[PDB]
Amino acid sequence: TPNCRVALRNDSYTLHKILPNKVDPLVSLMMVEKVPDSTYEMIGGLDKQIKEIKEVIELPVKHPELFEALGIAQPKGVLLYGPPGTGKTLLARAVAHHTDCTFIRVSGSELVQKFIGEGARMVRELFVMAREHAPSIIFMDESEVQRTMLELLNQLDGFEATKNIKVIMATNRIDILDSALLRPGRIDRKIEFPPPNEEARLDILKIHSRKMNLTRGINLRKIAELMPGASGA
Amino acid sequence: ASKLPLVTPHTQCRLKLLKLERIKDYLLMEEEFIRNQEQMKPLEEKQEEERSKVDDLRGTPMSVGTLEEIIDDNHAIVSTSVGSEHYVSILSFVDKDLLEPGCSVLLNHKVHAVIGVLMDDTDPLVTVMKVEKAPQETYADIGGLDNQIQEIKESVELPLTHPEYYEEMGIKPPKGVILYGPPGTGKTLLAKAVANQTSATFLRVVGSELIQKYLGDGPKLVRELFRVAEEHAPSIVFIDEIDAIGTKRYDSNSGGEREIQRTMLELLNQLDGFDSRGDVKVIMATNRIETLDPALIRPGRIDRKIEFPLPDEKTKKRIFQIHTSRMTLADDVTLDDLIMAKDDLSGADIKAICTEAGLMALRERRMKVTNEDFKKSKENVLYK
Amino acid sequence: MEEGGRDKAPVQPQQSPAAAPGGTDEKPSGKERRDAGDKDKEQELSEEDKQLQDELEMLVERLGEKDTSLYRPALEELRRQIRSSTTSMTSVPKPLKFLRPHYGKLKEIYENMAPGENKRFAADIISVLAMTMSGERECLKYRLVGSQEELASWGHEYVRHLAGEVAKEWQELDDAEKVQREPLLTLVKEIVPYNMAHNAEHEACDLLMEIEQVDMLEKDIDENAYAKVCLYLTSCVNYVPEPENSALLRCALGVFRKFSRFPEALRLALMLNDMELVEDIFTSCKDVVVQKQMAFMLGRHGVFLELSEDVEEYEDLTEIMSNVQLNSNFLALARELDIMEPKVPDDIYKTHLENNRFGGSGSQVDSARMNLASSFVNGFVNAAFGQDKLLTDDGNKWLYKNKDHGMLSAAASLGMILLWDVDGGLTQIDKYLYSSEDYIKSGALLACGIVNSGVRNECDPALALLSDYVLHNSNTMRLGSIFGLGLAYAGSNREDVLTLLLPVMGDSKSSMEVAGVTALACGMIAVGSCNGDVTSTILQTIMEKSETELKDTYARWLPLGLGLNHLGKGEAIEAILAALEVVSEPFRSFANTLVDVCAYAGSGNVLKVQQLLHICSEHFDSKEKEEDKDKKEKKDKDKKEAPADMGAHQGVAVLGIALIAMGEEIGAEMALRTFGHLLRYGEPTLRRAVPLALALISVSNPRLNILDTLSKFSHDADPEVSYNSIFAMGMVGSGTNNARLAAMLRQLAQYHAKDPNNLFMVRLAQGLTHLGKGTLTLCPYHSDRQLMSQVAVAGLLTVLVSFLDVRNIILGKSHYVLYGLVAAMQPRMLVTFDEELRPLPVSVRVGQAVDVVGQAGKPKTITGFQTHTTPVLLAHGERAELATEEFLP
Amino acid sequence: TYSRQIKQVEDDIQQLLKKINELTGIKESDTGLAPPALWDLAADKQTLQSEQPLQVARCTKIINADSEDPKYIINVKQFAKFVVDLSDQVAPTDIEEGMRVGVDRNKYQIHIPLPPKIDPTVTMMQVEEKPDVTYSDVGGCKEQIEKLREVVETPLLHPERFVNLGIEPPKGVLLFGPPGTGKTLCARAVANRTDACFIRVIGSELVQKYVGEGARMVRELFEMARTKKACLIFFDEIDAIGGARFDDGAGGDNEVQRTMLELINQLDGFDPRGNIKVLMATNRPDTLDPALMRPGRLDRKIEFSLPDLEGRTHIFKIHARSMSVERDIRFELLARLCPNSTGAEIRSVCTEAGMFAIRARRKIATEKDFLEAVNKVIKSYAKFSATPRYMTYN
Ligand SMILES: Nc1ncnc2c1ncn2[C@@H]1O[C@H](COP(=O)(O)OP(=O)(O)OP(=O)(O)O)[C@@H](O)[C@H]1O
Ligand SMILES: Nc1ncnc2c1ncn2[C@@H]1O[C@H](COP(=O)(O)OP(=O)(O)OP(=O)(O)O)[C@@H](O)[C@H]1O
Ligand SMILES: Nc1ncnc2c1ncn2[C@@H]1O[C@H](COP(=O)(O)OP(=O)(O)O)[C@@H](O)[C@H]1O
Ligand SMILES: [Mg+2]
Ligand SMILES: [Mg+2]
């Protein structure tokens, strides 16, 4: 295989034996960042947003034929918004986890940089690893991100032909992001994350208290009413 | 291989019969002459004996080095992989034509003498900027412009497909093309139709990604962009959103506005330098046309200036016909109520309504799109 | 598959010809009226060329083929009406009734009797009826008859007239590009007796059209650019009267029956030179036709225009002789001094500049043979009135310093400086003639023949160089006096001074290098008659070369004048005359190949080219006939300059594979001089393949052999970017590639391309392709470089001033009587049209537009506009009269 | 008639070419090998002659010599420094200090001196090749050409009219005006006609990434230029390489000014450049530095103004001499319709009006085809116009 280790003799430099499988640079990139791997079973009270995020990302992989029956273009970009600490990251991590996607997040760092390329004069060199793990998902945190997303959305607008690549941006305060990103054909669906109410502060406590050693008789309902909607964090 | 380029009778003439029967004689006489070499001087196989003589000359360890100069009497200064460079000699089976300074070579292990050259594994930025396949549907997908669709073929397509019309006029085709208008009227959309049609290599770069973080790295990227464009073919360079080089300031760029300027001076060279340009067409697109430098928009660098208007209310009806072509449209709807909903809705607004109305159908597992889908579509798309 | 239903034709012509044996006997009406129903209905359903799937022509012969074999032969009482219904119906599908052995049995249906007026049912249809079959008649049937039984029965007699109207039928129906199919009809019919078919089709072409001449006209010369010798004999003399009998365009007579001059009969073009002086209307074509008769493809015409009308129409001759030559001096006088040229450019020696800092210091090269090359900072740059006054001080101070052969060389440089001159060229010599030296006067008086080259007026028929010659008891006075007059009178065919210089051959004086260039002098004069020259040459050859086995001074000089004496005829009689003449030992049979292929300059006779290789291919030849096999390859160097690019690609594909790749002595020593003979054009196919074997010097051989390929790879004229290939080799040629024998040579390479900026057309193709020899002045030098010993002593007579037939450069000249017009010109890459749509696009590089005396260039066809109509000569030839007419508003 | 018969006899002989050329050896499409019938010179002899007697001769750099003895101090890339000796084959003359030499791997002794390092980004900016622009294309500005041409080439083509009169002619010249006026075009005509080395520099190539990196490229330019006898340096768009020294507060644009000071030092003072002639060309000269505008560096100050009227009429005759036109059109009417127009616009008028002839059907333009191109180029693209904020050079 290309990019595979070998053994090698030294007197004549003859090939000896295949030495296995070192790492993918995409694997070492996610190993640096260490996203907190999540699932649907640790989601507290976000039932309507899970239905919205599946219609855009989950469905055009398992059933790409289902949009040809409607004859509309399949969506590409998702914007998530709300106050910080309300679960933007864990929802995006879960959706990639439950339909077998390579969850790639870019932050524009420089320890990351040595695995993408030597200089990477663009950001678009990220796609060479991304179209190799073809059903992948690009994720971006909270103005360098807003220029990074415009460069990606112009590539996957018709110029990129390899399908099943989607981008997800998470930020707060949508009234200050760029007007070029607020062109109505640009972002396919925007999803608001409210702070949780009394019914939704309860089950986040319920899921988190699974790994504590509890005493019988607690009445968590009284506890969740003491917090007047801080966040899910 | 390139034995005879003459085909011009193109019939059953004796001349096509005579020419190829002359070439029949030159071939067999060349055959029978070189047949007599191994008959009277066998002396080797020549299929592998001279080959294995070379293969036993060059060692099994083959180190890869790097040229940096050439002295013509078969010895040149080459760089090792460490940094300590040598003054080795060059062989005769080395085909001394593909030797540029910086080209990867093959050295000896013992005396490091120049054995062979190596094909380059290029590049992780050429393949970034080179559009591989044709993007999308044809010019029939656009609809409604019909005046500037003629204009772009006039400057790009017709110079390439019919190189006769300009010669009979004795003229050179117009050089540069810029596309400007309000946002979302189809500037990027028309460039996809050119990339559909053409046979030239098509290069695309956003204007935002011209700006860099190191000093002097910006103008270096422009010099190697037009290097790539010239070294292939007749080609098309598409630069999108070039107002973004000047409007937004980013703190990643170390130099301030007086590094943006030095980048623009290099681009201002590459369009109308004094070097022999070649066959490279340039297409540019923006929506803030009043912001950028008029020294770059002078005739000589950009010749044609194409304005895009907002869609008219009889051309809007054409656009609804296009984006609702292959969808199972229920007969509840009337498209004319949707036309004058916003007085100045772009072409991008129409596709944003048509896709989002289809998404409302899949929430209820339906197959056709009703009227109240579009009623709650424009509430979702427009008004927020 | 929708079969059935409408099957009328697979049923009723399946019934009625099947009932035709049932309705021939005892049914007299159905034998004819159903046959008349079978003749017209098969005729009517076949005429449209849109339904080629006829409903009978591929349907009736499933049984009708077995019917017709019992209908036509087995009836045996065929009448006079029922054969016009049989053979008009049964001879139509027979190219498709029969398979590929049709060719022996077209006549078992047709030659029973040709029914009437066979084109009556071949009117609307182009070639499906019988014009494909008429091609099948002349293909195989007429060829077996007309091989040794041309004068024969019905297979020739009506076949002439059957090929009469059918050849008229191609120019009858549509007048499409099927007009050029008639040269496919006239030539396949009676290939060698082409004139018996052409005389039937010359007079028919005379009444054919006056617009449908010109594309068939170029179609014939497309077939006449190469042919078999008897075909090239026949089709070119049939080519002549079509601009005379049908058309009277009549101005392409002179240059394009130089095509017909040497092969057919040397009197025949002289009978066409008679056709010049008959059509005396009036002056404009009359001036331009005889412009070329002096110094463009031959001379020797100045004795046929002193008739009784010597006023101006026959006083053109002296104006043809030297005055338009003086207008070709007025080229360099007024027009070339205005564009660029100063009196001393001199600075290609200054272009040898930056090696003093390229790697340290300089002031090192102090070779005295460099000063031989330093003669050409003067000598090469000063052509076309580059006259020098005290700028020859590099030639003045080296005249009186050393190098006796350079006293010859600096004095012979002055002939190139005042070139094409009669006015003051003699006067410039005399200020440096008087030195009382064998080497100064003999070099200066040899240059006196250079100055008047092409003048041939009274300068010295027996005056100056005969007085030089009769001084002889010694060195180059004996030698350098016969070279100049044979140069100056090379275009002459005068008998007298050839017999002044015939006892030079018959002296038997043992100065051998004089006798070697003696045959080289007289061979330049005549190419035809005077077999007593051939007697005079071979007698001293038997008297000297037989009683010795020594150097190529015999071999490079003495037989070379014989091939010039019999140049340019593919008759293969001169091979019988000269090769049987010196039947001898094989080193005197070196000249077996000399006079053989010098008669075979440009044609297609590739049966010569196989016997140019297969006799002595390699044979490994341990140092015996390597001069011969180099000379056998030397005669492969012609036959490739003018098949019009057809063998030029086929020669570069062979020699780079054959000789320099996988040969022993022919490739490594000599096989590069083809490229010094194939082209001085300049194209990177061979221009990049030669320094692969040059910059790799291969110093193990006699390394001046590769350095022989150094200077004469710079042999290409028309200066280019090739200074890069030479000065970089001139950089490594300073230390290495030693200056002790090559400092003359690397700059002789360098100063050669830029001789001046202009005056480079020495490449033997005029009009479009005719010869203009040319070859007689050049071929002695390429034979001379075999190999060594003349780079110092003997070849300096040749290596300076060998080729001097530079018929200079341009075609931008008006020559309307006042000389006031400039032009309206437009130069282009060469034309590509053979047969295309009407109007045919000539050429494709329209981006250049000029009006005045500008350059020629390598592949250039130049046309005009402005409705000047350019009505003079229309073909090419660089001195159009340029009349005008404007009847187009 | 012989439809297949010419075809398959064509096809097999086109195959019989390839079927035996595979039996000669051009094949095995390589990864860096030669034509096999070309390397036969080093096939047996120089294979064992250029390899086995000849050695590697690792190349070095010399620090200095010392008195009384050879005893040369040498230096290599990263390894140590030695004390070395010559061979016999070379004299001790051309082993001057600060010189690259080749050195064997065992005894460490000097074989041959080497040419110095050229720093190959300076190597690419030598032009090597000439454009096709003649002074006949620069019509309209004849007096500006003549005042230019007497500085660049007449001391080089005739270095005797100036010496015997006793004057040292000027050395530098800048060319400045509005854009599209003909500045870069007129410089191409100089490189067409000249003969010396013509080293071009675009001012946006000296901005580098490190500190003081750009000032070294200015030296290596003038190092190789002093080696040549005559040379012609061309600077284009030098408003990038330096405007003025204005340093305030945080030191900004400090790095480019050190490159601009090194360029000033190579032009004047202390054993000067000699026979090197420079030629700048800017777009807005008001930004440039007063110490750079000083004569002795930038003596001539050729202005490229807009053409008056007869300048414009001559430009139409250049860009429309080679196009199919109606005979009876007048250009003098056209030049009155373009009052302040550059030469670049007049070319675009001529190239646009030919397209109108290609729009419908026809083969030659008319007078009204020009007038339909005038109001589109001049009066409809007038929103941009590029000139009126550059006449004031701001
Ligand atoms: N006239 C039109 N005809 C057909 N489709 C259109 C038209 N105008 C816009 N669209 C749709 O709008 C989408 C976006 O168009 P496009 O991005 O090319 O406009 P733009 O002006 O280039 O946008 P921007 O100004 O943001 O670059 C396209 O996918 C296209 O489908
Ligand atoms: N006097 C003139 N005659 C003919 N053409 C001209 C003239 N002046 C300018 N041009 C045209 O202008 C173009 C070259 O302009 P040039 O590059 O010299 O502009 P400039 O003066 O250098 O300004 P910039 O630096 O912005 O390019 C050429 O296409 C040329 O045809
Ligand atoms: N709805 C939720 N249910 C469970 N845990 C949550 C929820 N929202 C936030 N968290 C907690 O917040 C952390 C994730 O941070 P997150 O809120 O995703 O960042 P962001 O502010 O980008 O959304 C996790 O440790 C998780 O335990
Ligand atoms: Mg767009
Ligand atoms: Mg410019």
XYZ file of C-alpha atoms and ligand atoms in Angstrom, chain B residues 172 268 272-273 295 298-301, chain D residues 137-141 177-186 188 236-237 281-283 304 307 311 314-315 318-319 342-345 347, ligand 2:
73
model
C -7.586 39.739 -31.111
C -2.036 44.089 -11.267
C -0.986 43.125 -18.001
C 2.682 42.463 -17.420
C -6.260 50.673 -11.863
C -8.849 49.615 -16.861
C -9.162 48.365 -20.450
C -6.095 46.334 -21.144
C -6.566 44.208 -18.049
C 3.942 50.585 -31.955
C 4.572 53.425 -29.488
C 3.187 56.126 -31.735
C 1.866 59.375 -30.323
C 4.765 60.066 -27.950
C 2.045 58.882 -15.818
C -1.547 57.711 -15.529
C -2.221 53.996 -16.054
C -2.697 52.642 -19.527
C -0.557 55.398 -20.980
C 2.195 53.276 -22.463
C 4.795 53.003 -19.729
C 5.216 49.238 -19.626
C 4.673 49.098 -23.394
C 7.515 51.504 -24.106
C 9.210 46.417 -24.019
C 8.471 48.006 -12.410
C 5.861 49.232 -9.896
C 8.437 52.985 -14.012
C 5.837 54.009 -11.452
C 2.139 54.769 -11.397
C 3.778 60.208 -20.191
C -2.227 62.343 -26.259
C -1.218 61.604 -30.734
C -1.741 58.053 -34.861
C -2.786 55.429 -32.304
C -1.631 51.549 -35.284
C -4.334 49.395 -33.753
C -5.552 56.734 -22.869
C -3.890 54.650 -25.522
C -5.281 51.581 -23.793
C -8.859 52.672 -24.421
C -7.126 49.802 -28.588
N 1.008 55.320 -27.441
C 0.461 54.096 -27.584
N 0.358 53.517 -28.785
C -0.186 52.304 -28.926
N -0.663 51.577 -27.912
C -0.622 52.037 -26.649
C -0.041 53.357 -26.422
N -0.111 53.593 -25.117
C -0.685 52.518 -24.544
N -0.986 51.587 -25.452
C -1.632 50.306 -25.114
O -1.582 50.146 -23.701
C -1.260 48.804 -23.350
C -0.054 48.777 -22.434
O -0.248 49.710 -21.396
P 0.862 49.822 -20.264
O 0.965 48.505 -19.556
O 2.088 50.461 -20.838
O 0.142 50.847 -19.290
P 1.068 51.576 -18.237
O 1.275 52.953 -18.794
O 2.228 50.672 -17.960
O 0.140 51.635 -16.940
P 0.081 50.351 -15.992
O 1.367 50.397 -15.222
O -1.150 50.567 -15.170
O -0.007 49.191 -16.935
C -0.911 48.075 -24.618
O -1.975 47.191 -24.948
C -0.836 49.150 -25.662
O -1.452 48.703 -26.861
